[PDB]
Amino acid sequence: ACPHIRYAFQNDKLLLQQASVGRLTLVNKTTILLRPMKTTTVDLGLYARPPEGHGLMLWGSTSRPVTSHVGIIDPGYTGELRLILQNQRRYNSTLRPSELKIHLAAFRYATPQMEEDKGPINHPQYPGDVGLDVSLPKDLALFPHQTVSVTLTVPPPSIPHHRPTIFGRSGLAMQGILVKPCRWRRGGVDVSLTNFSDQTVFLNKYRRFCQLVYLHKHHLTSFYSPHSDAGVLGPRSLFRWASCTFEEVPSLAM
């Protein structure tokens, strides 16, 4: 099934750790400073085109007090990929070399056919959209250092062999607001938001605050192994990415 993920990579602050087991991992070569309750952004000098019928997912994993956004990359994006990190601590902290792994992998997804929004669920913009955006059904405030859940009870459209999952949007993650990715199961979901910044953040009713992605079910496993990662989704299912090889395509860098 998974043909080739075509990718370019140039960054002398980062190292390619391996393009095996269907997932590309980079690792930091130098210390990265993380200012407290501020957004730290790592430009990767990484570019990538997912093979047909697949999307790319981008994420950091670390053993330090730092949370990273999980990014769903539009299958048509051709720009430099960024990792967006958020700082737990209230003082300067650092990620030493290799304390930060950065992962890029693909997954099969489907797009429901919808002419209209179904409640908070915004219909797709064209047949292949990776994620449908989902709107806040009520004005929200988040005090600094607060988590808030929003409940969605609308039943998502249904697609055989696919598993509706919620991820955050990078715009909000740029603002210090992160969504905990998780399964949107049959009777509704509670989406977790955390204000990592130092200011109250007001979010307006109807604002798009996360996105719905239909992962194929082969990407959900109950097994920890080298082909899975428990850091992406909520306890219960781990994300297992497609098996793809990477094919280096220098000319994609821009």
Ligand X SMILES: O=c1ccn([C@H]2C[C@H](O)[C@@H](COP(=O)(O)NP(=O)(O)OP(=O)(O)O)O2)c(=O)[nH]1
Point out the annotated binding site for substrate: 74, 82, 169-171
Nearest approach, Cβ of residue 131 and ligand X (Å): 7
| Closest C-alpha among 100, 96, 128 to residue 112 | 128
How far, in Å, CA of 202 to CA of 143, rounded?
Answer: 9
Nearest approach, Cβ of residue 218 and ligand X (Å): 23
Nearest approach, Cβ of residue 110 and ligand X (Å): 18
Q: CB-wise, 69 or 103, nearer to ligand X?
A: 69
Residues of this chain that interact with ligand X (CB under 6 A) are 58, 69, 71-74, 77, 81-82, 84, 169-171
Nearest approach, Cβ of residue 211 and ligand X (Å): 7
| Closest C-alpha among 160, 244, 243, 150 to residue 204 | 150
Q: CB-wise, 72 or 244, nearer to ligand X?
A: 72
The amino acid at 208: R
Nearest approach, Cβ of residue 91 and ligand X (Å): 25
- Sheet of 4-9, strands arranged across: 46-49, 4-9, 245-248
Secondary structure of the chain in the HEC alphabet?
CCCEEEEEECCCCEEEEEEECCEEEEEECCCEEECCCCCEEEECCEEEECCCCEEEEEEEEECCCEEECCEEECCCCCCCCEEEEEECCCCCEEECCCCEEEEEEEEEEECCCCCCCECCECCCCCCCCCCEEEECCCCEEECCCCEEEEEECCCCCCCCCEEEEEECCHHHHHCCEEECCEECCCCCEEEEEEECCCCCEEECCCCEEEEEEEEEHHHEECCCCCCEECCCCCCCCEEECCCCEEEECHHHCC
Residue positions forming the annotated binding site: 74, 82, 169-171
